[PDB]
């Protein structure tokens, strides 16, 4: 809607309740710059090189976390405890590169609409779970209000491999899972 | 029986930091009650949610939140933005296959500015071309699949040709059966 | 360099 | 209105536990807590917002701890007193971002030996 | 760290007094300024934000030099009433403010 040359989202906090969900994160032209651990209480940048060279006081993520939980109260209440409806996240299975067996490439699950922020997104390879090697971008936040999350299965290509996508959501009857093979 | 509530300051940057846009929204169950923004100059209710709380935060914090569009925008542009998201730079990886379709994939390139061509023993094609969206791979690469619907023959030569503001001359990568 | 959150302002009640 | 603190004085001898007490100002959500010395006049020690400890970066690292039980009082607690801890102790509370700070009174403690 | 200067002012009626802070951090965007009256608590009484470079408010000026990195509290017409402790503060963000060692101000009757 707003059109200019550079945008950054700085400042932007979730808060759930209950259970006490949180996400603090900043955002430069639609990529993760960093989110804070708030259980650890640290910055982490998405790129490392980046917070070499750039200071963020997790102070900051915390902050706004914690004003963020005085304003879900007062605003729940004032909606007279309006719960929010859960979306049907829709996801899409791509690599990152061109796939060579043998090679080392990476599966990109990339999971739109998602609301309320609270996903599993795990990957099945030969229909059984895999646990290592995969990491999971923070929360990102769409014009909508809702979120979107992508996951990263790094793999060696083989023959005898199938790999599957699941996403699980309170928004969604069964769990979805969408299949990519080479 | 879940409730979110949600803040997202943004700032918007065009031609450097000659024109700012400050916005910082407050969104209760993806619905934006409460909204400052610095064309407007003032808190805004956006929606029924934000009646009763648009005139408090004008109250208490309207004189600090507009000052925030220098003391946070530009600020975080010019000493963090600079030198290290405006300053990145990924040369592209070009690479053809045959689907029939050759399929010219450009990956891990940053930022977005890419054109991409298909060339057919030296004439560019346009016709059968078809290109899919950017692809935002998430980690700060983006990748793209420029497709060509063509019917190889023995000695034609098919050329995927790209340009990148991280290239000082284009890649050019041939094809032949 | 140092980059600077966006303060969220607490809400009347 | 005004941040109340308690007790305005305090005089302990040493290796005994003391507990500071501050109450904000009623809708005020972030919390300071200062030393105040005439050397080194205001020195920043602890910061709450809506309870949540934020930045404890001006703390003693042994002996210190800051506490916010509830949303209107806030506790400020020192083991093992001993006499370089003497100092007045002012707690702080603000209602908007980097705005007006109310400050309390003080809890004037003094450790002897 | 915010360095104060002078530790201690005396200053005749109707006079100006003028207090100067230093401060390390190039973020800082805010500098407020405090007086304390003896055994009462401190009390904000005038400030400054980044984007502004001078201020007066009823016989209250402060300066703010972002490049050198110092600012000013400036009373003019000095009474009485003004003599307390001056504290000046520089804050990066809200969750810490960083204040001088003070300036005891003593307006001479």
């Known amino acids: 809607d707003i059109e200019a040359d550079h945008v950054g989202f700085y400042g932007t906090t979730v808060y759930q309740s209950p259970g006490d969900i949180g996400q603090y994160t900043h955002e430069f032209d639609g990529d993760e710059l960093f989110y804070v651990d708030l259980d650890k209480k640290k910055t982490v940048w998405r790129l490392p090189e980046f917070g070499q060279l750039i200071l963020f006081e997790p102070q900051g993520g915390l902050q706004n976390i914690a004003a963020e939980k005085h304003n879900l109260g007062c605003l729940t209440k004032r909606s007279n405890f309006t719960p929010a409806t859960n979306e049907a996240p829709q996801a899409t299975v791509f690599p990152k590169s061109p796939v060579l067996l043998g090679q080392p490439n990476t599966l990109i699950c990339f999971v739109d609409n998602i609301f309320p922020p609270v996903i599993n997104i795990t990957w099945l390879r030969n229909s059984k779970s895999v646990t290592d090697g995969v990491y999971e971008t923070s929360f990102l936040v769409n014009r909508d209000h809702s979120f979107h999350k992508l996951s990263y299965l790094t793999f060696i290509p083989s023959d005898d491999d199938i790999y599957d996508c699941k996403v699980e959501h309170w928004g969604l009857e069964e769990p979805v899972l969408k299949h990519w093979e080479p | 029986r879940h409730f979110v509530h949600q803040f997202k300051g943004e700032c918007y940057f065009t031609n450097g930091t000659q024109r700012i846009r400050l916005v910082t929204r407050y969104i209760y169950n993806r619905e934006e009650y409460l909204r400052f923004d610095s064309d407007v100059g003032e808190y805004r209710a956006v929606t029924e949610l934000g009646r009763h709380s648009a005139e408090y935060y004008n109250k208490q914090y309207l004189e600090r939140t507009r000052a925030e569009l220098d003391t946070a925008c530009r600020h975080n542009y010019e000493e963090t933005e600079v030198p290290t998201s405006l300053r990145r730079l990924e040369q592209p990886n070009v690479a053809i296959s045959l689907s029939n379709t050759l399929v010219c994939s450009v990956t891990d390139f940053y930022p977005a500015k890419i054109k991409v061509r298909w060339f057919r023993n030296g004439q560019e094609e346009t016709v059968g071309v078809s290109s899919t969206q950017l692809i935002r791979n998430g980690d700060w690469t983006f990748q793209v699949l420029v497709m060509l619907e063509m019917t190889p023959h023995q000695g034609e030569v098919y050329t995927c040709h790209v340009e990148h503001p991280s290239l000082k001359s284009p890649i050019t990568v041939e094809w032949r059966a | 360099l140092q980059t600077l959150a966006l303060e969220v302002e607490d809400d009347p009640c | 209105m005004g941040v109340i603190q308690t007790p305005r004085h305090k005089v302990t001898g040493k290796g005994q536990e003391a507990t500071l007490w501050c109450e904000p100002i009623?809708?005020?959500?972030?919390v300071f807590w200062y030393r105040q010395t005439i050397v080194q006049g205001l020195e920043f020690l602890t910061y709450?917002?809506?309870?949540?400890?934020?930045?404890d970066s001006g703390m003693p690292k042994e002996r210190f701890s800051a506490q916010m039980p509830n949303q209107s009082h806030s506790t400020l607690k020192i083991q093992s007193t001993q006499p370089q801890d003497s100092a007045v102790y002012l707690c702080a509370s603000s209602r908007q971002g980097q705005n007006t700070l109310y400050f309390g009174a003080g809890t004037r403690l003094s450790v002897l030996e | 760290q915010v360095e104060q200067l002078p530790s201690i002012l005396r200053v005749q009626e109707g006079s100006s007094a003028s207090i100067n802070c230093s401060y390390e951090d190039s973020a800082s965007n805010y500098f407020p300024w405090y007086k304390q009256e003896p055994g009462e608590n401190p009390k904000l009484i005038i400030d400054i934000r980044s984007n502004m470079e001078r201020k007066q408010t009823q016989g209250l000026i402060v300066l703010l030099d972002k490049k050198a990195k110092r600012f000013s509290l400036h009373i003019t017409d000095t009474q009485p009433g003004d003599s307390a402790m001056y504290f000046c503060?520089?804050?990066?963000?809200?969750?810490?403010?960083?204040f001088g060692a003070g300036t005891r101000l003593k307006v001479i009757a």
């Open positions: 009623s809708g005020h959500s972030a």
């Open positions: 709450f917002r809506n309870q949540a400890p934020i930045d």
């Open positions: 503060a520089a804050s990066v963000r809200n969750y810490k403010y960083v």
